Amino acid sequence: IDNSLNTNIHQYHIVGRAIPTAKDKNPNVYRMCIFAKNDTNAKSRFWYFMKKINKLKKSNGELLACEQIKERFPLRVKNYGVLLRYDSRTGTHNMYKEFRDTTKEGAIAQLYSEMAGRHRARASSINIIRISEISSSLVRRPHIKQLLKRRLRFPALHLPTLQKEYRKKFASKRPSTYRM
Amino acid sequence: MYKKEYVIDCKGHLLGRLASLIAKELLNGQRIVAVRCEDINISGSLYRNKLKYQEFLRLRTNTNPKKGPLHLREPSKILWRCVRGMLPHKTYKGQLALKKLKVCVGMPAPYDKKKKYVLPSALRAFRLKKHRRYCRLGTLSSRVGWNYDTLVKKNEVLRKQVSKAYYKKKVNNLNEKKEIKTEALNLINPEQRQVLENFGY
Amino acid sequence: VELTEEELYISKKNLLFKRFVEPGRLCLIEYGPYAGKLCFIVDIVTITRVIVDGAFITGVPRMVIPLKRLKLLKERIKINKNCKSGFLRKTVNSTKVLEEFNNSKLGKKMIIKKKRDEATDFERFQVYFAKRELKKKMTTIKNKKN
Amino acid sequence: KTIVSTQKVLIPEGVKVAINARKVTVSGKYGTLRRSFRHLPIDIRLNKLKKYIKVVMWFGVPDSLACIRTVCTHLKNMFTGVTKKFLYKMRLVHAHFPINSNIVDNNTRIEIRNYLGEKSVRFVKALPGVVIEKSPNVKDEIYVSGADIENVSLTAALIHQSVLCRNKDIRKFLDGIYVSEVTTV
Amino acid sequence: LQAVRLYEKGVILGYKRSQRNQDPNFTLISIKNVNTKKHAQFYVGKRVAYVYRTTKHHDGVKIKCIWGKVCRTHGNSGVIRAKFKTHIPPKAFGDRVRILMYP
RNA sequence: AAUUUAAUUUCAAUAAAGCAAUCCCCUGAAAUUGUUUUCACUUUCUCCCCGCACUAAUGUGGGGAAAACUGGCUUUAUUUCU
RNA sequence: CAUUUUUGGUAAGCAGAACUGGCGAUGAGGGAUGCUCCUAACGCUUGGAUAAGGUGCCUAAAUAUUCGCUCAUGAGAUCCCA
């Protein structure tokens, strides 16, 4: 529906297996959940992991399932812990981060934004190894601990912007910053 | 626009945006009187701006400064130069736009009688954070020796005090107009009076 | 123990800060698909973003927006933090906040403007005609006063 | 980063405050002191009845925390100054030549003669509201007093800066007038 | 007073330029009220009249007219492309135009 | 501006019932190959105790209770109140 | 001449090779400008919608939205490219 705050990164549960052979009379079936912008991207990342772990390329296997995975309670805000492997210019690093968000997909988008903004790391150079809902008391980030207080009621303190129609070129008098 | 003369009170406005908005209007078609032009804001610091003006002064010519550039010292002329930069002034179309612009430091009284407009996106408050350094264009000009400042300071104060006397008189007049209007609202025929009230009187 | 005349003192403080991001405060959306609608502050996602939830009158679903897209109103209704749509409807109906908004000067300017926007051609003439009657009478009163 | 940072600033009993829109003014026995803080964008609020001031910042960063701690210290100095003037006791050191300290202009300008036997005059005028007296008790001692710790210190610094040698060794030659003791009346 | 105008005001901008390139088939029109594509879309099919003053008597008169019609936007701020029955002169850039209420 | 019948772990009210209280839709933390079992977690503009105004606050720091309004489940009907 | 592989030579907008594509023999749009980079090869016209590429102004489209990071008493800002 939305296109004003929207994230098109979604989560897909993907299942595949090795093709039956004389050597592989009974295959091994493999499942994983993967965050991607589309089904082809999800599949290609799944295939890359099948290649990295197993000996199975797209040629050597067959896809059992790919399906988008559904938010249980979208109105509820939840504490996500996310564990990364990422590449810098001069090396590879592991990192564990906390985000309070409605859903895991919002968190992954936030994570890519954070890694890009603060570390210059592109989506290609990041690998999420597990994102999951965790207890509020177990968060290490002060900015999320501050939200988790009993009484939250800060003053808003931001600029007006309106929209294109009432985005006047010139004005008779000077604007009111406080807004009250 | 669609009006004979825009007058702009350029106090508290940020240089680049103020110039750009003026320029596109000149190109669109409009005579524009830029007024109160020492109280324009540059986003750099005083030292940083002094350095930039120093580089501008350093730029001259080896050959013959009679064919050199102009190091205009008026804050109004600084705005004018910036607008000129934002016009294709070596054309005829650009020259016509350039001619349409009028610049003045302080409030010239024939155009103080006129209404003043502002450009709301271009204020220092509007596009700069509070905790980041800035510098007033007149302050910078004074630093690099323009020094026509005290006369304007006296003139602006005298004009402002008269404007206060004008504002109180205007308030008196408006209050009296409100009082007669409210009294003579009773005398209107009921249905018509109800309609006028409905649509916001 | 409790306040007596110290009650006046706390009351008569001149503190600038008001319109806190409290749960159940009314806010006017200024941008996006649901612009010009009024809505309550439910949750706070993060420093930029909040969970807003429309009035049943205004027709805006429960959803995340940036706080920057709201113009906060004075009124606020105190509610428990976990509440959903039935309780929000029951509370809004109870507290009659839209009437308070209509009474409020910004609300009043908006509703007057709304009438003026929707006014028909005959209605427009009637406003002109009424103002003309008023000016005639008002000028006659100005003659009267001296 | 943080949403909320606060400070609760105790005020002495006699202080007559007037601090609106971050233009802080404190009056007391020794004077009225005015000091803008309008570059610092924070919610200091007064409480007259139960005394104290509450300072609060919205959406703090460590820069903001530095500002809050700085302002509260600065405000406390303003209270301290009006209640009791800040006195900088400056001892005049010389290992050879008598250095003549003649206070002129009603405790406003100290005349200094004969630094390193120079046979010449250095006059060093004070800032507004900072009195320069001499000590009856200790011959080398000079009292620099006023309502503001910054102006008295600056006045003292000006006196040091005025005296100091161009080019005879800093380790060897120790002569000049220095700030010994920072007190109040 | 004596006249009633019965059009809305506009400003004949340039032709439908792009950086350092010219298309003279389409003209760019600023309509006084508009500042959005969506609002401009209301006025999209309307007949447009450029009236201009001249030196000599032509058909006994010193006023002449070019006709065109608005037809599609040129931006999100509602600046609109108009196609005319013959190209309007660059001399008339920044001049006024009449946007009729019909069809 | 919409629209059709499908498809895909999708609701939300409506007003009468029930059910459990750190309990539950949930989510934690624990003892080849499947289980399964433990205790951890809600609210409050309710009440109490200490600190009595000690707070960012039309309150508050710490310590305890209370309830099921709030949320959650099981129902029974109801969908242009939403 | 370019990418990639490449030999000599301290290196070289240097000399010498390989594969392929260009230019030469080529307009057009971008790369601020530019024989070669990128987009793309061309009768005459009308209209559309896009590419490369853009959208503060010069200069056509956003002082768009959205999250980070960033103040520099010579900051930084589109391959070749200084």
Side-chain angles (χ1 to χ4, degrees), chain D residues 4 6 8 45 50 52 54 56 58:
Chain D
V4 191
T6 58
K8 185 182 190 180
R45 56 264 199 144
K50 213 172 193 293
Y52 71 77
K54 292 205 177 194
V56 59
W58 310 116

Side-chain angles (χ1 to χ4, degrees), chain A:
Chain A
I1 188 166
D2 178 69
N3 216 122
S4 73
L5 200 69
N6 65 297
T7 51
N8 52 27
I9 303 158
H10 298 302
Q11 184 187 23
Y12 305 87
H13 190 263
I14 303 192
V15 195
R17 73 160 188 193
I19 298 168
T21 68
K23 191 184 301 295
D24 298 297
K25 189 171 183 178
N26 295 297
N28 294 298
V29 189
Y30 298 96
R31 61 187 294 195
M32 190 165 67
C33 59
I34 185 65
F35 292 81
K37 297 172 70 67
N38 58 73
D39 304 67
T40 299
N41 186 239
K43 292 169 190 184
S44 64
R45 295 275 75 228
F46 182 85
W47 286 120
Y48 172 97
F49 291 116
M50 290 281 276
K51 187 186 71 177
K52 296 308 279 84
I53 302 300
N54 320 102
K55 298 294 183 182
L56 299 173
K57 304 184 288 183
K58 295 172 185 175
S59 51
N60 308 124
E62 62 186 302
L63 186 71
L64 182 55
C66 174
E67 62 183 297
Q68 209 282 296
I69 292 300
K70 305 178 189 170
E71 176 49 58
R72 192 176 186 127
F73 292 130
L75 75 173
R76 298 187 191 173
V77 200
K78 316 187 181 72
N79 322 293
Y80 284 96
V82 62
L83 164 64
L84 294 78
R85 176 209 167 289
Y86 74 97
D87 296 295
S88 69
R89 300 180 295 204
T90 49
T92 302
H93 316 279
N94 285 112
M95 170 175 175
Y96 184 2
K97 185 74 178 194
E98 289 82 72
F99 291 124
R100 180 172 172 272
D101 198 284
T102 56
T103 193
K104 15 75 187 196
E105 293 156 58
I108 295 293
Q110 188 174 185
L111 184 62
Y112 294 155
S113 306
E114 167 74 355
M115 293 307 298
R118 202 184 303 288
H119 213 315
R120 322 301 163 193
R122 289 81 182 192
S124 50
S125 67
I126 304 165
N127 312 107
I128 296 92
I129 323 190
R130 311 201 299 258
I131 184 165
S132 58
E133 298 79 354
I134 196 57
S135 188
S136 302
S137 59
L138 299 177
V139 176
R140 289 73 57 95
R141 275 60 182 186
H143 311 120
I144 306 302
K145 186 179 180 180
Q146 288 157 21
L147 297 170
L148 299 166
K149 301 293 99 182
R150 178 188 73 248
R151 186 166 177 186
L152 187 61
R153 57 113 69 160
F154 50 84
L157 298 170
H158 56 255
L159 298 162
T161 188
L162 309 176
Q163 47 71 37
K164 306 289 175 167
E165 170 187 49
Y166 267 99
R167 186 178 284 230
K168 302 192 302 185
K169 187 174 283 170
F170 19 61
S172 149
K173 297 192 290 287
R174 299 170 181 266
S176 182
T177 302
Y178 194 44
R179 313 183 76 170
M180 306 198 188

Side-chain angles (χ1 to χ4, degrees), chain D residues 131-148:
Chain D
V131 294
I132 304 175
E133 302 190 296
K134 55 175 61 180
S135 179
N137 304 87
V138 173
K139 61 183 181 180
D140 58 80
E141 185 181 72
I142 298 296
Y143 301 144
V144 178
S145 195
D148 169 45

Side-chain angles (χ1 to χ4, degrees), chain D residues 35 37 69-79 150:
Chain D
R35 190 73 163 193
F37 291 90
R69 216 287 213 189
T70 306
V71 72
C72 65
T73 299
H74 202 323
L75 186 57
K76 183 176 183 179
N77 291 343
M78 296 177 68
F79 297 154
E150 185 185 74

Side-chain angles (χ1 to χ4, degrees), chain C residues 46-145:
Chain C
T46 187
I47 186 169
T48 57
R49 296 175 188 182
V50 297
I51 296 185
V52 120
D53 196 352
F56 295 88
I57 307 302
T58 58
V60 184
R62 205 166 190 124
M63 55 76 168
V64 183
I65 36 170
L67 186 55
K68 301 179 289 173
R69 300 188 180 187
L70 296 174
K71 184 180 179 185
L72 304 91
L73 291 313
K74 179 165 56 60
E75 273 46 65
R76 178 263 168 144
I77 308 96
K78 194 163 188 184
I79 50 172
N80 299 350
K81 62 172 285 285
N82 302 310
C83 304
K84 300 169 70 192
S85 324
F87 192 75
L88 184 62
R89 210 178 315 108
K90 289 282 189 285
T91 46
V92 74
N93 292 352
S94 300
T95 197
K96 301 180 171 57
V97 66
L98 180 58
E99 192 62 67
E100 312 302 300
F101 179 78
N102 298 336
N103 282 269
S104 191
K105 301 183 75 189
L106 182 60
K108 193 187 305 298
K109 295 165 197 186
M110 289 167 59
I111 64 180
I112 289 168
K113 179 57 164 61
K114 188 175 187 293
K115 293 181 178 183
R116 289 202 279 213
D117 289 347
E118 293 300 284
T120 72
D121 199 61
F122 191 18
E123 292 149 39
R124 290 188 298 253
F125 175 68
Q126 287 173 96
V127 173
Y128 186 70
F129 188 64
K131 179 59 194 286
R132 190 159 71 154
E133 186 167 299
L134 173 54
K135 182 162 177 165
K136 291 188 287 183
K137 295 177 174 176
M138 186 173 66
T139 48
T140 304
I141 293 299
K142 181 181 173 65
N143 296 118
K144 196 174 177 65
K145 292 293 185 181

